[PDB]
Design a protein. Structure first.
Length: 246
């Protein structure tokens, strides 16, 4: 069992490395100096557009990048053992209600308190420049930075995140699922793999597993806040997902 749980953890990490171009390990090395173009004002944004309405151009740009993120997450989900054996309507339902929770978890790997890496680490857009965008675009990334600073304090690595992301995807309580029991059976196995992984990898963080379970609830609140903010404000694929999260 435990040996199988370590094998499951390794399989997920290997697929995680392949499905996502910029891992947290590489992101933190770029963020700490171990090089991206810094966008900190209107002048550097225009310079960076040449090197790599303004508020609408930014929002539409990340709208396309989020759709590409959905593609990467879908590729990773299909590598989770047992996922492709689920009914295709359940695979689509799990992805539709979970991709944004995954996007914000992985986005945290690209952020610090000062800004976020963009374009596969080629750029770095500051948190305060994003806040300077006209309303309502100036508050569109702020809740994500707030979550990331606290989430990053847990100091998870890529091997932890690969299992954590799989746990979120295999949520048996998404609306419209046909066969809840096989999804819950996979998640329980993933949850045991995650608990074993955190115990081995974080010998000085005794309550890390419990804190991560609470983060999964926080992510649902971030998504709810995000779709409400988007109701006040569009890519046709995202509208398909948003129509069911409103
Ligand atoms: O290309 C990417 O993957 C990206 F850089 F992440 C982005 F999604 F395009 C972006 F984050 F929205 C971006 F970088 F901000 C931007 F390119 F859209 C922009 F804002 F710089 C511009 F003005 F080009 F749209
Ligand atoms: O680093 C980037 O290139 C990026 F665009 F910021 C992103 F990380 F890909 C991103 F997470 F997809 C995002 F665009 F920031 C976003 F998806 F979080 C969003 F802000 F667009 C959404 F609207 F989805 F929250
Ligand atoms: O609108 C539909 O009829 C649809 F096919 F269900 C869908 F909305 F496109 C969707 F499949 F849910 C989806 F949003 F595109 C999806 F995200 F689930 C996905 F299947 F396309 C992806 F693969 F991206 F997860």
């Amino acid at each position: 069992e435990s040996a199988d749980l370590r094998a499951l953890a390794k399989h997920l990490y290997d697929s995680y490395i392949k499905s996502f171009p910029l891992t947290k390990a590489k992101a933190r090395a770029i963020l700490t100096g171990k090089s991206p173009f810094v966008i900190y004002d209107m002048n550097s944004l225009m310079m960076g557009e040449d090197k790599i309405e303004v508020a609408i151009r930014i929002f539409q740009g990340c709208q396309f990048r989020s759709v590409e993120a959905v593609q990467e997450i879908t590729e990773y989900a299909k590598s989770i053992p047992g996922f492709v054996n689920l009914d295709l309507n359940d695979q689509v339902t799990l992805l539709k209600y979970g991709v944004h929770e995954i996007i914000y978890t992985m986005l945290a790997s690209l952020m610090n308190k000062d800004g976020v890496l963009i374009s596969e680490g080629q750029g770095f857009m500051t948190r305060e420049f994003l806040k300077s965008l006209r309303k309502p675009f100036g508050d569109f990334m702020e809740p994500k930075f707030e979550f990331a600073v606290k989430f990053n304090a847990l100091e998870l690595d890529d091997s932890d995140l690969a299992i954590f992301i799989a746990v979120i995807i295999l949520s048996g309580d998404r609306p419209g699922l046909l066969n809840v029991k096989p999804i819950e059976d996979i998640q329980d196995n993933l949850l045991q793999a995650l608990e074993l992984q955190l115990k081995l990898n974080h010998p000085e963080s005794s309550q890390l597993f419990a804190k991560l379970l609470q983060k999964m609830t926080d992510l649902r609140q971030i998504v709810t806040e995000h779709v409400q903010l988007l109701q006040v404000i569009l890519h046709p694929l995202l509208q398909e997902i948003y129509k069911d999260l409103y």
